[PDB]
RNA sequence: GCGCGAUCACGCGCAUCCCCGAAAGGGAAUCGGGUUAAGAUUCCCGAGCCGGGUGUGGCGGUUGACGGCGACGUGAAG
RNA sequence: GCGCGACCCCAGGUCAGGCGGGACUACCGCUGAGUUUAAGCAUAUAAAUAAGCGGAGGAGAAGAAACUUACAAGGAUUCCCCUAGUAACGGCGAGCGAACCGGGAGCAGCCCAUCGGGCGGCUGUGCCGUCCGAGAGGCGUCCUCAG
C-alpha cells in the first residue's frame, strides 16, 4: 500500500521475491527519515522506531524460511555442519548425546538376570 | 608527525569523551529516584584519565 | 665446477637420521646369540609355491567328500597348530623385529618333530599365504595329494 | 614417464640442493555451511553543519557521515549507486563522534547543489 | 595359554638371553627417537593384551621418555629461607613415580585422547622408558565396544591427571584393602583433617 | 619443501627461516597563491611530479646502436 | 657386478570426518612454607595447612579381597556414629593420633586379558544393499528362552 505496514503474518504469506522488494522499499524510506531528522518532526520519531522493527521482521522471517527450506531439501540427502550446531549447542550437550546409556547395557550375558513373574501367565 | 595517531587508543578516548556529557534533562522526570548528580563525569583539570 | 656431483648418502647427510644407525644395528654388536642361516631361496620358492597351493587347492562340497587344505597365517595360530600337533610344515620369516615374536617356534617345533622353513622376507610369506598384509609365521595343517614333494 | 630410475640418480647426484614435488588439493563431500548476506549500510545520513553548505557552494562537495568500517572505495561506490553521480575523490576522518566524517568531491557534470536539493542539507 | 606367554616370560629377564640383546639394540633407536614417539606396534603385546589392547580404531600406543633421578627443587643459589626440616633440593624425591610423569606428558600432547594404561619398556642410565596406551573417546569404534566405552563418559576426561590410572591408584596406596589401607582409601585428602 | 618459469599443462633450481622491534637510523613523489569562526604544504586555483598498474603513435634501432684515438658521449630464459 | 613394478617400516602434505585448548562459585587431585608452639630451640609443632600447579564432574574420588584375623566369624566400596584421645608416635617434653569391630545411611555385582569408514535406501542412537582398510568340558529327567 501507500501507508506503512506491517504484520508478521503478512510477511510470512509473501514470497521471497515480494519481501525483498519490501526490504528495498523500507531502507529507502528509512533513508528519508535520516534527512527528515534535520526536520526533527514527531512523525519521524514514531515512524523511525516502527520501521526499525519492520526491517528486523523481514530479516528474521526470510532467515527462518531459508533454514526451513535447507532442512527440507537436505532431509532427503546428507548434510549439515549448521543444523549440527542446533542439535548439540554444544560441547557439553555433545558429550550427553553419543548416546551413552542404551549402548552401554547392550551386549554379553544378559537374558535371565531378574525375577520372573506375570508375563508367562498372560500367555496361557 | 600526526598528533599521536593510533585509531585504536584514539577512538576509545573519544568515546569516554562523548560518554562524559550531561544527563539529559528528561531521566530526571520519569523517574524513580535521585538528586541525579550523574557522577562519572570527568574534568580537564582534576583527577586523571584512565583507559 | 664440473666432474662428479655424485652421491648423497656417502658425503652430504643429514638427510635421514632414524635409519642409518638402524643399518649399523644389523651389521654391528657384541653379542650373545641367536638367529641365522638358510635360504638360497631355490628352496624358498618351492616352499612358497607349495604354500600357495596349500590355500589354493580348496574345493569342499556340502558332503564330507574331502574338504582339501588348510593353510593358517599369524604367530598364535601357527604356535597352537604346532602344539595341537597337526601342522605338516611351518614357515618362519627371518625379517622379524621384535625378534621375540618368532623365537619360540624353532625350539617348539623340534620338540614336536614338525619341520620348519625360514623364508627371508615377511611380506612374501604374507602374500603367499594369500593375506593382504605381511606374516611373521605360517602353517600348513594338512596338504593335498602332494605328499611326495612335501616329504 | 619420469622414472624413478631418473629419480634415484637425481638423489645421488646432488650434494645439498633441496627436495621437490608439487601437488593438488580438493574439497570433500559434506557441504560446507553458511549462506549469507551480511551487509552494513556504509551511508548513514548526509552530515549537516554550516561548514558543509559552504562546501556545497564553494567547491562542489557533499558531506556524509559514514560507518567506521568504511574506506574510500566502498563510499565512492555507495554514493554512486544511491544518488546517481560520479565522485572524483573522497576524504576520510575519524571524529570525536566515534563516527567517520567523509567529504565527497563530485564531478561538475552534476553539481552538489541540485544533487542535494531532493534531500536538502545545510 | 597362547604365544603371548613366551614374550611375557622374556621380559622378566631384561638382562638375559635374546631380550638384553634385542632391547639394548632398540635403545640405539630409543635414544635417537623423541620424548614423543608414536608407534603402531606394542613392544609387549602380552602386557598390552593384559592392560587393555584391542586393535581397533582410536587405539594408539606411544612411547614416553622420562629422566632418571628424583626432583631438584627451585630456587638453588637463592635458597630458602626457612627452617631446616623444610630445606631439601635433591634429598626429596617426588612422591609421584616416574611412570605417572610419563602418563601426564603423553596425555598433554595427545590432548584429544585419554590414557588407558601404561607399561615398562626399560631404562639405560638416565632415561626410563614407558609405553602408554591412549584411546580415542570420540570415534564410533570405541563407543560401539562395551569393553572400552566406559572411558568415553565425561567424568573420565583427563583421568591420568586426577590419578585414576592404574599407576595413579598404585602410587595413591590403593593396592591393598584392609589393615593399613586406612589412610589411602578413598583419598589422600579424604577426611579434610578432621 | 619453497621459489620460478610456464599455458597446453607441467616441470625445474636452492640453502639457513618468519613476524615484530626507530611515527627523531634508512626511505618513491609538492609547491606558490587563496580561503575558514575554527583545517590547511591536507580543500581550492594554478602548476608540477610520483607509484602502481594497460593501449596508442612519434621513431631511434633491426643478421642486439653511431660518434670520439681514448676516456667516453648520444634483445633474452638457465 | 645392475635397473624396474609390487609388499612392508618411517616421514611430510592435503581436504574430510571426529575431539580436545578457555570458563562458573565453592566442592573435588600433586608439589609444598612461615609466623606460631614446645614460654628459648634445631627432632617435634603450626601442617601435608596455606599457597603455587594441573585437571574432572554434577558430584567427584573409592569398589567386588593376593581383604579382616588373632577367634571365628565376616564378606566390594564411600559416608554417619562412635570404637578413642584407647593402640601407637614423641626432649616418649610439649604435643601427635588412629584401625578391626560394632550398627546404620545405601546396596550390585560384574568385565577382561567381526570393527569402523564411504555412497545408496529408508519410519536417521538404527538395520539392509554393496565397496575399502583392520569360569571351561562329558552325561542326564527336564525347568527357563529374545523381542
UniProtKB/Swiss-Prot annotation, chain A:
InterPro entries: Ribosomal_uL29 (IPR001854), Ribosomal_uL29_euk (IPR045059), Ribosomal_uL29_sf (IPR036049). It holds the Pfam family Ribosomal_L29. The keyword Nucleotide-binding does not apply. It comes from the Eukaryota. Transmembrane segments: none annotated. GO terms for molecular function: mRNA binding; structural constituent of ribosome. Coiled coil: none annotated. GO terms for biological process: maturation of LSU-rRNA from tricistronic rRNA transcript (SSU-rRNA, 5.8S rRNA, LSU-rRNA); translation. Keywords: Ribonucleoprotein, Ribosomal protein. Belongs to the universal ribosomal protein uL29 family. This is Large ribosomal subunit protein uL29. The lineage of its organism: Eukaryota, Viridiplantae, Streptophyta, Embryophyta, Tracheophyta. The gene is RPL35.
